[PDB]
Design a protein around this motif. Sequence first.
Motif, mmCIF file in Angstrom:
data_model
loop_
_atom_site.group_PDB
_atom_site.id
_atom_site.type_symbol
_atom_site.label_atom_id
_atom_site.label_comp_id
_atom_site.label_asym_id
_atom_site.label_seq_id
_atom_site.Cartn_x
_atom_site.Cartn_y
_atom_site.Cartn_z
ATOM 1 N N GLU A 102 38.448 50.497 39.816
ATOM 2 C CA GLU A 102 39.652 49.998 40.467
ATOM 3 C C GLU A 102 40.737 49.598 39.475
ATOM 4 O O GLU A 102 41.892 49.429 39.878
ATOM 5 C CB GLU A 102 39.309 48.809 41.366
ATOM 6 C CG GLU A 102 38.436 49.169 42.558
ATOM 7 C CD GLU A 102 36.956 49.148 42.230
ATOM 8 O OE1 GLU A 102 36.549 48.356 41.355
ATOM 9 O OE2 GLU A 102 36.198 49.925 42.849
ATOM 10 N N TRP B 144 41.825 51.506 36.999
ATOM 11 C CA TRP B 144 42.670 52.681 36.812
ATOM 12 C C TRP B 144 43.638 52.875 37.972
ATOM 13 O O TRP B 144 44.753 53.368 37.769
ATOM 14 C CB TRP B 144 41.801 53.923 36.622
ATOM 15 C CG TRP B 144 40.808 53.787 35.509
ATOM 16 C CD1 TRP B 144 39.450 53.761 35.622
ATOM 17 C CD2 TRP B 144 41.098 53.653 34.112
ATOM 18 N NE1 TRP B 144 38.875 53.620 34.382
ATOM 19 C CE2 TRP B 144 39.864 53.552 33.438
ATOM 20 C CE3 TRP B 144 42.279 53.611 33.364
ATOM 21 C CZ2 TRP B 144 39.779 53.411 32.054
ATOM 22 C CZ3 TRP B 144 42.192 53.470 31.991
ATOM 23 C CH2 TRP B 144 40.951 53.373 31.351
ATOM 24 N N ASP B 145 43.232 52.507 39.189
ATOM 25 C CA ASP B 145 44.157 52.548 40.318
ATOM 26 C C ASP B 145 45.289 51.545 40.137
ATOM 27 O O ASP B 145 46.440 51.830 40.490
ATOM 28 C CB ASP B 145 43.407 52.282 41.623
ATOM 29 C CG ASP B 145 42.226 53.211 41.815
ATOM 30 O OD1 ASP B 145 42.125 54.207 41.069
ATOM 31 O OD2 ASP B 145 41.396 52.943 42.710
ATOM 32 N N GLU C 180 48.098 52.753 37.667
ATOM 33 C CA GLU C 180 49.096 53.663 38.219
ATOM 34 C C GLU C 180 50.269 52.898 38.821
ATOM 35 O O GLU C 180 51.428 53.299 38.665
ATOM 36 C CB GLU C 180 48.455 54.570 39.269
ATOM 37 C CG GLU C 180 47.388 55.506 38.726
ATOM 38 C CD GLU C 180 47.970 56.649 37.917
ATOM 39 O OE1 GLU C 180 49.137 57.018 38.161
ATOM 40 O OE2 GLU C 180 47.257 57.183 37.042
ATOM 41 N N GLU C 181 49.985 51.797 39.520
ATOM 42 C CA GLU C 181 51.047 51.010 40.136
ATOM 43 C C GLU C 181 51.912 50.309 39.095
ATOM 44 O O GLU C 181 53.102 50.080 39.335
ATOM 45 C CB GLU C 181 50.446 49.985 41.097
ATOM 46 C CG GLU C 181 49.864 50.588 42.363
ATOM 47 C CD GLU C 181 49.292 49.541 43.298
ATOM 48 O OE1 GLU C 181 50.052 48.654 43.738
ATOM 49 O OE2 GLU C 181 48.080 49.607 43.595
ATOM 50 N N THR D 288 50.278 54.466 47.665
ATOM 51 C CA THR D 288 49.059 53.855 47.163
ATOM 52 C C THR D 288 47.884 54.321 48.015
ATOM 53 O O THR D 288 48.060 54.911 49.084
ATOM 54 C CB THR D 288 49.164 52.323 47.172
ATOM 55 O OG1 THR D 288 50.510 51.935 46.871
ATOM 56 C CG2 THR D 288 48.240 51.709 46.130
ATOM 57 N N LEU D 289 46.670 54.061 47.524
ATOM 58 C CA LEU D 289 45.475 54.450 48.266
ATOM 59 C C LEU D 289 45.402 53.735 49.608
ATOM 60 O O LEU D 289 45.036 54.339 50.624
ATOM 61 C CB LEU D 289 44.225 54.162 47.434
ATOM 62 C CG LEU D 289 44.044 55.012 46.176
ATOM 63 C CD1 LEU D 289 42.838 54.542 45.380
ATOM 64 C CD2 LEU D 289 43.913 56.483 46.537
#
Lengths: 221, 15, 1113, 263, 83, 94, 104
Positions: D160, D162-163, D166-167, F49-50
């Motif tokens: 999580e 790495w997610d 991105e933001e 976003t996811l």
Amino acid sequence: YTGRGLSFLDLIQEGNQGLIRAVEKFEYKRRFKFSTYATWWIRQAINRAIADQARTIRIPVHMVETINKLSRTARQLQQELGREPTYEEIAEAMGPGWDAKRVEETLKIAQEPVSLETPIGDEKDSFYGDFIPDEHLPSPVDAATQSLLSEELEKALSKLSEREAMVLKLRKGLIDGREHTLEEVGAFFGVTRERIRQIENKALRKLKYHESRTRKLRDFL
Amino acid sequence: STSDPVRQYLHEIGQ
Amino acid sequence: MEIKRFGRIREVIPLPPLTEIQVESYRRALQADVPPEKRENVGIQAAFRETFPIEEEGLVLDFLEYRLGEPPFPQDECREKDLTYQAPLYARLQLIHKDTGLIKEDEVFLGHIPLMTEDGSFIINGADRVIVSQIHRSPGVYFTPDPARPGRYIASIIPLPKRGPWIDLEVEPNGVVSMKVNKRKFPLVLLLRVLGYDQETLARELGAYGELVQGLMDESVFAMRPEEALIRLFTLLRPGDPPKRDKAVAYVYGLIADPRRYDLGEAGRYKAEEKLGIRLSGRTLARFEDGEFKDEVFLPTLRYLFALTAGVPGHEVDDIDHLGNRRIRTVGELMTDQFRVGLARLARGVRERMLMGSEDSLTPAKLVNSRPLEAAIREFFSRSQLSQFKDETNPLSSLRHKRRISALGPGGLTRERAGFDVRDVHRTHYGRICPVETPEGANIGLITSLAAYARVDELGFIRTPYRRVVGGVVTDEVVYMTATEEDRYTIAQANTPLEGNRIAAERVVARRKGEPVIVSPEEVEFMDVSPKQVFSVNTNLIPFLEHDDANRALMGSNMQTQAVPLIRAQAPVVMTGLEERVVRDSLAALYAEEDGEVAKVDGNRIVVRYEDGRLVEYPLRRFYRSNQGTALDQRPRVVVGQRVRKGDLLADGPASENGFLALGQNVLVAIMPFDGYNFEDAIVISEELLKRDFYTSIHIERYEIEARDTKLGPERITRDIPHLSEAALRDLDEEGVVRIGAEVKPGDILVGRTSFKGESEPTPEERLLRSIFGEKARDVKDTSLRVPPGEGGIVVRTVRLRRGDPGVELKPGVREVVRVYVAQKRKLQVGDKLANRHGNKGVVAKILPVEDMPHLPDGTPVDVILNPLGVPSRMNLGQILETHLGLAGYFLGQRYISPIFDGAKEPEIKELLAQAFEVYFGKRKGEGFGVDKREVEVLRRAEKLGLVTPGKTPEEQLKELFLQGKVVLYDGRTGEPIEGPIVVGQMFIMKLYHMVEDKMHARSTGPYSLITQQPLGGKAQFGGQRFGEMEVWALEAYGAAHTLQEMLTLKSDDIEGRNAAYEAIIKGEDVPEPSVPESFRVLVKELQALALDVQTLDEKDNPVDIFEGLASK
Amino acid sequence: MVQVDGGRFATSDLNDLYRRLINRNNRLKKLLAQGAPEIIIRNEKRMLQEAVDALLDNGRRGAPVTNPGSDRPLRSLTDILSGKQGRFRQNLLGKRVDYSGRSVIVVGPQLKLHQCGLPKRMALELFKPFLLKKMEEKGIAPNVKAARRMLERQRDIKDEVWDALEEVIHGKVVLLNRAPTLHRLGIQAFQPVLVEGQSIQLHPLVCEAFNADFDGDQMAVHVPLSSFAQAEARIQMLSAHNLLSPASGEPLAKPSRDIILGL
Amino acid sequence: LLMGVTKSALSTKSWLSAASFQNTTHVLTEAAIAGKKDELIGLKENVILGRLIPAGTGSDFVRFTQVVDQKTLKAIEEARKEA
Amino acid sequence: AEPGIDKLFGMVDSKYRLTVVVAKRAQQLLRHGFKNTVLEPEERPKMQTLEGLFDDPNAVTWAMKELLTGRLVFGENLVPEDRLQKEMERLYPV
Amino acid sequence: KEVRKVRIALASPEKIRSWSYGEVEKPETINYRTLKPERDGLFDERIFGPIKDYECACGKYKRQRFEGKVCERCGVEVTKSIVRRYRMGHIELATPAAHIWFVK
DNA sequence: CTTGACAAAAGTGTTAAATTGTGCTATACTGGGAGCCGTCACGGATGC
DNA sequence: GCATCCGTGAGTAGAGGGAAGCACAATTTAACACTTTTGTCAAG
Ligand SMILES: Nc1ncnc2c1ncn2[C@@H]1O[C@H](COP(=O)(O)OP(=O)(O)OP(=O)(O)OP(=O)(O)OC[C@H]2O[C@@H](n3ccc(=O)[nH]c3=O)[C@H](O)[C@@H]2O)[C@@H](O)[C@H]1O
Ligand SMILES: [Mg+2]
Ligand SMILES: [Mg+2]
Ligand SMILES: [Mg+2]
Ligand SMILES: [Zn+2]
């Protein structure tokens, strides 16, 4: 005496001070020539100057003599044993009261500091001081942790009573930087020292219950 | 000349 | 797989030992095995006879002999314990009392001398080192013209370095000849008077040349006594110094006549005799005997100068860059020079120790202090420019390092003050110095390599072999000669046609003093041995060198040093013929001493039963770490019971395959653009290379930690680290060290260590924090060793050294030291560097699956795709010819040997391709397949491009394309053919030492400097990137004022700004305004130390304080 | 005069120069009080003048003063401030900075003109303070201090993170630099795209301005921090906004090599 | 008068920029005796002191620009005028 | 290239003035938590976003899009500096 | 309150003494066994300041409440340790010496 | 909120042991040692 | 004129590297015995 830490002109000037001393103490009734008596004072002045000014970190004269004796003893053992002597061998030849531990400690004392401008590598752009970090000033990460801890600690103190918070802030030294004993706190608030002891402990126990239910102050330890 | 302080001192004491 | 050989030149002699420049020179200096009574006056023996005897001027110290003992420790122990491989030195001395006549003899211990290993390297403080030879101007007498005024020459007398001053003889405009010593000019007539010369002698010898003698006939100095002239000369040489004879004769004698201060050398004396046609008794300018000075070389030097000005045919100027005037100083000579310097200091201490203290009772042991001698020897092998960290990336790397020649070092040139003349290729380099192998950059022309067949003689001059020619027939006699001797003959080229041993061509290409000429066979006197003697070892390994440009050939030979050993390394398909000798002479592999039978074969040892019956066991080196970090191992190549002859291979060393040098892999290559992934030297590879473990290398890293004694307490290596969970301590043993075989990642602990925290005042906030949780503090903190970011692997070895161990010499205050070895297997990835032998290099930018690669009609995909745009501008056509020969050998299953400048040609290559087509296409016909529909379409365009002959059958046209090295290639993505035929073949490609995994680095915050408070530099220090002056200019030109101010203050040295910036980001805020940098505060204080008042003011000129009142009294 | 990781001390050359001046100054005071002859006094005064010269400008007059046991001259006050290694050119006109990195470059043909390829591992360290705030905002970490402890160990990093990375970089730009920087086109701004691997991906059309190829060249990365710094980089320094040569006005980003050959 | 680039750069008014170019000892000696004051006009002097350079976004022509929406403007304008 | 970069350069006399206007506007949006924006609800920039589609956190992106609409006023000596901040705080508490 | 110009000029002997917090009288740097600064030396805390923030050289004051206070036993001012980067001293010469910049 | 009444801790005074600083030695002795040219090439300023 | 003196010569990275002894007097340090502090256990 050249090549022992002082320049040739410095040696001459220190020797001149010894020559002046010999003139005052010289006695011509003994029918001895001047150079016989003046040589003792000139040599003494040069030797004392070397033991006092040849090192960046000054070492007492008694310890300088010990260091010179230690080096001279090791050289004689080296040419007889055909190899570098160990600390045990040096200590035994040194005399009574010397062990291997004292030999190693003396050698550590006799170490001179290294220059910060010593060139490293063939190209003249890198120096020793380019690899030494500074450990005195706090890092940005450490400075930010202190601010976060302080703002969270004062937030938890607001759950206490007005009198309870003041007792802890004084008994721990969060004002003026100094801890305050039960006497000076009592003098400031006009109460005994046994009373402050209980309320200081009472406020501490209420903080423990709050922390366990939220886990907001544990990561700072 | 006079570039050697040691030589300068030796000349003075030789007088 | 058979090997086919090309070539016509028959070499009469093999290559000499490739390390004899290092090994032989050190043997001559030591003379350890020759009996003392038969030792020659060379090496350290000559040093002893020069300093001794030592006379008080009645005590005399005399030298008799010396000896060397056995090394205290073996080579393997020295590496592990950080020791030096050396042997003790003992000297036999006697003391003679001139008054009494009593002699006492004893042996004194002088110290240790480092030993050279069998391969030609040294082990200094546990590290391998190589001493690089030095080239310099030879001593002697030289004559050059005066550039300021035409028609005038200057005579120079040059001694050995640091062995006397230079002497210049020049004719002044007034006609009086002058002699210049130590930047002081004085008339030569005065010096000649001291040497007992009359006008009658001078007129007889030098009066038959012209008006020059008129300037050598002064009369005010002549009649003066030579002793009176001596005291007058001393006044000029030494102004101010009182004029005493004892101070005057001791100065003139020590200037030109003292063998202990002036040394012309063996090379200088030989050159002077050859040039001046005289016979020198010694190596000094003059000899002092019977209380008078005698001339030796001054008069013959002045006679040559006068005759040269007149213009006699037998006199000529000297070329200083001529290789006959330049000599090589080897490791033996360089060490002996430092040995003599240390011995001179020893004699000085002996002289002053015998004039004070126990005069009657003296012994040679008490007088001798060997510490100055040991200090000078250890300084040469440690802190000298010519003593260099050994390069052992592959076996070829270490072979080249020992053959390098350097013009730098003490007594040499300077990198910044070197001109164009010294860096150029001289005509005398032919056969002695390789013309192509040199580093591009500031060292170009200053560091070179020895030629393959060249060798250094006793006097230090490089010689090359030649074949004697008499009566037009070439003989088998080989003569080694220097550059000065070579200029007297006409030497033909080795490619001259011969019918047996007789020259067949009527016109012969030859050289006369370096110039090419055409002569008849009857005028030829000598012939070249081979084309290989012109180049070095690295350049001799490049096939088809004659088709490559010199600039690109420099890169090809240099980059072979940087190739890494591979687990499946193989020898190249096309070789030159030196691969076997390189492995043999590097001493990396193992060979049978004589005929015998192998008894025991193992991964660690090999035992051979020789014919005479003795048993010899050879331990093998496995998974060893070199200086560069590459893993060196030996793999056995025999079985139990196998019979072996003398010299047979027993075990392969690193980067070798059955005794052949193996620096890479053989891969199938297509030369074509591919979707922009070949852009600007980029390389596209197939995933099939990784599946078969091609280009896989093994590397080992070493980590170290120490436990010391402190005033607060001793550091302890332990497993009980405070405030650590069980997960972090899982892999450590009971002693606190990581277990062998564990996998370690960044942030993992290798060895645990505790330190005493010391005294301090816990902040008031931490005081309350610890009181709430009831946690008593500890007196120790975590100081353990952890894996650096971007590293890790497998633990393979742990080394522990403790105080008091035999041979372990730890620094004072150090208790123990622990070393850990971590090994990793590296596969090829994007960013790794690849190169071939012709100078083509690039990085891997794309890895494709097998179904995306172009494939042959039989279904075989290629491995590597290369851009054709890199060939035309670089003019390196050797890679194209190598690819063509590789394609023929791929289908014929054979390898080739093509020597440089005499090997395979296009008619020979095209006939091999004809046979390869009959198996590439004949197999298809038997299986029942004709011509593809897609192949017909490509052939239709081929004749439009003029590649094939119209009217032929499809099979015949396909054979025409094959003879040009081109085949029909299908696209893996679409299945359609490429619209044009593509060159496909086999090429040899190496993997280089530069890898992306060792170069990537990043940092947010980290350590800072002490004084400037700016971030440190270097990946090893976790430092930041340098924003230099030219980078600041770029931001100014863009107009980015706020971006520039951030880097100057907020991110470098504004302490209040950098602390506030970090806290703002972690709270979701914007960074604050910057403040004054710390470097400006330092500048103000440093200017005040120079008694300069620097003040910052405001709009109204009132002072502004930038120190916040911290420095105002 | 500081201690090092071991036990030995390190000090600057200025301390030795100050010691010489004090030793000779104190000796002259004692000589004057004893009524020494003028010959001895004159030698001391001459030595005091030379000691002051060495402290201010060593080697300007006479033989330079060197430390015993070596031939290296001592660094004086003038040597500190002057030259290429002096205070001005080394610490004032140029500095080392934070939030910077370096790696090998490869060609990215699929990128847009305003894009570059940034390895994930480099981006984690470059944007560390921004990432710690982001992890705290979500449920990844309880606080910033606990978030930093997770990133210390590689095996402790969850998927999580790495997610969240991105933001963090959404819309931001970085600076790429190649030495030597002959003109202002040696620094350009790109919108990063996180990639797997350890090498930076460069657009083919900007190679000529950088004079960069792919046979071993490396590059540096920098991160503008504030809103002003981001705005200047995105408007004035973006690669897609600098298409003409400032020196002549002719196009500088144009087809070359394989692109011309194909067309 | 005509000068070369080296001599023209060394005769500039600002002693901070001249000292960082070359001939630092000669520049500092002459500036100290005359009591020179540096007005920080060029780009080099502002870089040494870590100040904003007077070019690009740091120039006085555009540095003092203001931005405001119409809703805020109408409230600000009316409130002051009617009062 | 930035969307509408050609039109943005044509709105100012100096190219460095556009950068100042954008940078200052971005600071205003961050200070008030994007509550002072002049954009419509359907005009707000978004990022994928996811979990789902949310608002764009980049304030510089917001400022550039606001300038293209034409609802912002920029210039020199528009309003007093103290009067501007106090009025903005009263209209948009944060 | 903002810097607008920088002036450089000569410094008089009176001005040099006004900068200094004390006179260095000994060449000693630090003690060889305790590793602490020596009195009247090149690293004296009575001249240049304390080694650590708000702590004298005699262990009597260790708090920030005594800001701007000088200990009556050791003479070290209780303040921040960062003042050691800014506070200067001076040496009183027995005889005048010329500045080499204005000579050579 | 308070009194009592210990118990360990912190503070004080004396003193012996260890460490550090200073003076002195009487045959006669009286001006240093080290270095050694591919000496870097070229403008610019100054002195005369 | 031409002789003497003086300051100047691209950038980033890596990677190794890193010679006396004694006696005597002052002076500082460490051990140890009381003695006031100041937190505490228990009531009330
Ligand atoms: N994409 C494009 N890229 C390039 N040019 C393109 C392109 N598109 C159109 N053009 C056109 O083509 C002309 C060039 O055409 P060309 O054939 O001459 O080029 P090339 O093949 O020789 O490539 P090049 O990189 O120059 O080779 P290199 O000299 O070995 O480079 C070594 C580099 O290392 C550096 N270094 C090295 C040593 C050292 O001490 N210090 C140091 O700083 C330095 O930066 C040096 O440059 C261009 O002007 C343009 O108009
Ligand atoms: Mg190189
Ligand atoms: Mg290129
Ligand atoms: Mg390149
Ligand atoms: Zn105090």
